[PDB]
Design an enzyme around this catalytic site. Structure first.
Site, PDB file in Angstrom:
ATOM      1  N   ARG B  89       0.827  -1.191   0.000  1.00  0.00           N
ATOM      2  CA  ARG B  89       0.000   0.000   0.000  1.00  0.00           C
ATOM      3  C   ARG B  89       0.873   1.256   0.000  1.00  0.00           C
ATOM      4  O   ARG B  89       0.574   2.226  -0.698  1.00  0.00           O
ATOM      5  CB  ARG B  89      -0.870  -0.070   1.260  1.00  0.00           C
ATOM      6  CG  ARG B  89      -1.878   1.040   1.527  1.00  0.00           C
ATOM      7  CD  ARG B  89      -2.937   0.578   2.555  1.00  0.00           C
ATOM      8  NE  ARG B  89      -2.382   0.071   3.822  1.00  0.00           N
ATOM      9  CZ  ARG B  89      -2.447  -1.197   4.242  1.00  0.00           C
ATOM     10  NH1 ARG B  89      -3.043  -2.127   3.506  1.00  0.00           N
ATOM     11  NH2 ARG B  89      -1.918  -1.538   5.410  1.00  0.00           N
ATOM     12  N   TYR B  90       1.996   1.179   0.711  1.00  0.00           N
ATOM     13  CA  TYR B  90       2.910   2.307   0.864  1.00  0.00           C
ATOM     14  C   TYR B  90       4.075   2.394  -0.109  1.00  0.00           C
ATOM     15  O   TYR B  90       4.880   3.333  -0.037  1.00  0.00           O
ATOM     16  CB  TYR B  90       3.372   2.390   2.327  1.00  0.00           C
ATOM     17  CG  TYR B  90       2.201   2.553   3.282  1.00  0.00           C
ATOM     18  CD1 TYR B  90       1.553   3.801   3.422  1.00  0.00           C
ATOM     19  CD2 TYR B  90       1.668   1.444   3.974  1.00  0.00           C
ATOM     20  CE1 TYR B  90       0.383   3.943   4.227  1.00  0.00           C
ATOM     21  CE2 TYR B  90       0.499   1.573   4.782  1.00  0.00           C
ATOM     22  CZ  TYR B  90      -0.136   2.827   4.897  1.00  0.00           C
ATOM     23  OH  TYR B  90      -1.282   2.966   5.651  1.00  0.00           O
ATOM     24  N   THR B  91       4.157   1.425  -1.023  1.00  0.00           N
ATOM     25  CA  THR B  91       5.217   1.410  -2.035  1.00  0.00           C
ATOM     26  C   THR B  91       4.687   1.486  -3.460  1.00  0.00           C
ATOM     27  O   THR B  91       3.513   1.208  -3.734  1.00  0.00           O
ATOM     28  CB  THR B  91       6.169   0.178  -1.935  1.00  0.00           C
ATOM     29  OG1 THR B  91       5.413  -1.036  -1.989  1.00  0.00           O
ATOM     30  CG2 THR B  91       7.024   0.227  -0.671  1.00  0.00           C
TER      31      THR B  91
END
Lengths: 451, 440
Positions: B89-91
């Site tokens: 989700r964060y990459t």
């Protein structure tokens, strides 16, 4: 959570239709593996887990839940009973024919597009909606307790709308001649006409949904009740048991045996009597069990950003308003699309008159721009001269000049038709009526559930 | 489970590249969301849980794991130390430039394809590879015991490859003038030269890796040992901790972390102790195994490189066959396009005299115009009748002529084809080579 007055769709359902439409997974084209669909739906839009999306897809693919289905599924989607569906890796689906009408005219820059969850794509706030899905399919939601909008007959909701297009301050009782009350895909029999009126102007009411019970007499001087259709949302899984619990733990009269004759080509169920049993027994099955149950209305949909208790009158009055914004936009988009084409076609008529002169002008040139800027002689434009150099040898044949002659006429009359709809709103409202009847005539299905 | 000799990749690693490249997530373009990448890899190719795919995709973006990374990740994927990654989700990710060289010539009908897990789409069995990812990036897995192939320097592997192309019966000793040993992206120093050779001929070898330890003699005669780089697969989270457990329960004569670990008249025997009792010096064991013919095979340097050269020739032989036919199916068209600009007015004034598109193609018995060639004439743009867009049509005829002539030579002699391979590998070396880390 809650649907909006316009398209009648809950957030999740809208993403589903738009996604499946974007990937070209329509009714005419081949079925697609649900795993891939739910994979594109979750990846680009709605992230709240896989088992929240496939849950919605399966509900929309059940003719026993929605009046007019929105998703079409091949495989285990569930039965008329309390039967469960298989997993997403095991089924294949596409949209229904009618669902294509909710999405019809999306490309025309009709509805407002909002920015994606992770800010990558663009998604619609509302679907153009060629049919009033809110009354047609209903809704069950969040908000206090729980909202309840019942499903109505497609054809009947159309008539009501067409009446309210010509008559804006239409009295609730008049509308009820076109849409008398709800129409459940599970059938049944709805009572309390005076109570349905209350539901239509405000949003609340109690109606009692009885089952279409038919009595057929058999041998030995005995009778035997058979249920053809049970009420909405109510399952025949534990109701068949609830009727058996009244005879095994004897509370009435001659209630003999209870046998479920299932569903294949029709629903069939209670061999009561054996010899002289009263039909006052039927009133115990009604009052105690869910063979008859009150369906409470609570018609709430999102209006202008905020939730609002709504009735038949402003639901339809919010639908017609949306449809005019969609049609005025469809027209504005096509007027521009048709003027942009006409211009080129007009210039293409010119280069057909001075064919042999323009043959030598392009031949005696150097590059593309030394052909485009050399088209100073009639006066052509950047896009018009572009269109002449980018025309092929086949477009200069007998048939392709004649079909091109008729395209000019077809285009000029379209712009003429389109200018009337925008200029006078009386005629725009008449296009709305025509389009809805064009939809009714194709998708109309006669009503079930007596009144 | 085990990588493939030819492209040095495990089915999952391949699936990632092939899926990302099709979705146009290459180096030159922007960093596309990791959720979408994995979503498509799972929905179309690999249905074995999301956390198995991201882990593989996160490994190919760590320069402490793969020597020449195949995935490029923007954001938290972990630092040089044992630092943990983020969630999908964060990459956001894409492929690196060098990864594109594995997929070079994919669509040219070069490599065999196989149907999906659900018979919906087509996925490659192997990638066309322009460099030997087996030696260059290695592999660590489970195939019996555990399989281990170390990462090596790109350049040294190419030099050895070009020699093997010219000398098929290459000896292990002569080969080590080009490829003298492994090259870990962690640094260090490899001992046991004859043990490296044992590995290169058989497949198993115990060599021993040691850290890069320099002496830092500080203020007032007091000394301190500074470690520059610890060995491969050894995390410094547990290693700095076990070098603290030695001073706590004092088995010798402080410890600070900055890759830089810093350690009155204490002897230089602490260095020898810390080498034998900690992981500052450990035995690296080779176990080079991979799938050849559809079965795991223990393999040495020569049959690894033999499988590679044997692969590269079929890729090239198939690339050239694809391109010779493409340029033949295009020259045939171009030759007709020059035959028409010679009889300019006759073709313009015949098409206008015709009914439709197909009736104009049938009217092309004016010399004898074929079906595919006639399509091009009636569907030709009016801008292609101007001088500069007719001059280039003479250069094109010449280019297509010289392309076919150049290509036909590569297929007809398995000597000049090898010369194209050597050339191609040298082109790759010139572009991606990097000086070696670690020593002997």
């Amino acid at each position: 959570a809650l649907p909006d007055i316009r398209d009648g769709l809950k957030p999740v359902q809208r993403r589903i239709l738009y996604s499946m439409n974007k990937d070209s997974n329509t009714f005419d084209k081949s079925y697609r593996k649900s795993a891939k669909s739910v994979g594109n739906i979750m990846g680009n839009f709605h992230p709240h887990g896989d088992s929240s999306i496939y849950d919605a897809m399966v509900r929309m693919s059940q003719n026993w839940k929605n009046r007019e289905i929105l998703v079409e599924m091949h495989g285990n989607n569930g039965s008329m009973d309390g039967d469960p569906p298989a997993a997403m890796r095991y089924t294949e689906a596409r949209l229904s024919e009618i669902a294509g009408y909710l999405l019809q005219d999306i490309e025309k820059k009709t509805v407002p597009f909002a920015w994606n969850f992770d800010d990558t794509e663009k998604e619609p706030t509302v679907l153009p909606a060629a049919f009033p899905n809110l009354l047609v399919n209903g809704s069950t939601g969040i908000s206090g307790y729980a909202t309840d909008i019942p499903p109505h007959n497609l054809a009947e909701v159309i008539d009501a709308a067409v009446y309210m297009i010509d008559h804006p301050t239409a009295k609730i009782d008049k509308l009820m001649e076109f849409l008398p009350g709800p129409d459940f895909p599970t059938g049944a029999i709805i009572q309390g006409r005076d109570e349905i009126k209350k539901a239509y102007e405000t949003g609340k009411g109690r109606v009692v949904v009885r089952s279409k019970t038919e009595i057929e007499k058999l041998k030995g001087g005995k009778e035997q009740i058979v249920i053809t259709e049970i009420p909405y949302e109510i399952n025949k899984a534990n109701l068949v048991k609830k009727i058996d619990d009244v005879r095994v733990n004897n509370k009435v009269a001659g209630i003999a045996e209870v046998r479920d004759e299932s569903d294949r080509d029709g629903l069939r169920i209670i061999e009561l009597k054996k010899d002289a049993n009263t039909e006052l027994v039927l009133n115990y099955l009604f009052k105690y069990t869910d063979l008859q149950i009150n369906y409470n209305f609570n018609m709430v949909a999102i209006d202008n950003f905020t939730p609002r208790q709504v009735g038949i009158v402003p639901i339809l009055s919010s639908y017609i308003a949306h449809r005019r914004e969609v049609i005025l936009a469809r027209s504005r988009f096509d007027k521009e699309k048709a003027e942009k084409r006409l211009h080129i076609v007009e210039g293409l008529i010119r280069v057909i008159s001075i064919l042999d002169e323009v043959i030598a002008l392009i031949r005696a040139s150097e590059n593309k721009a030394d052909a485009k800027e050399n088209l100073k002689v009639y006066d052509f434009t950047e896009e018009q001269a572009e269109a002449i150099v980018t025309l092929q040898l086949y477009r200069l044949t007998n048939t392709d000049v004649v079909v091109l002659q008729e395209e000019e006429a077809e285009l000029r009359e379209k712009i003429a038709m389109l200018a009337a709809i925008i200029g006078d709103e009386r005629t725009m409202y008449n296009l709305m009526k025509k389009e809805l009847r064009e939809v009714k005539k194709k998708f109309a299905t006669p009503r079930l559930s007596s009144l």
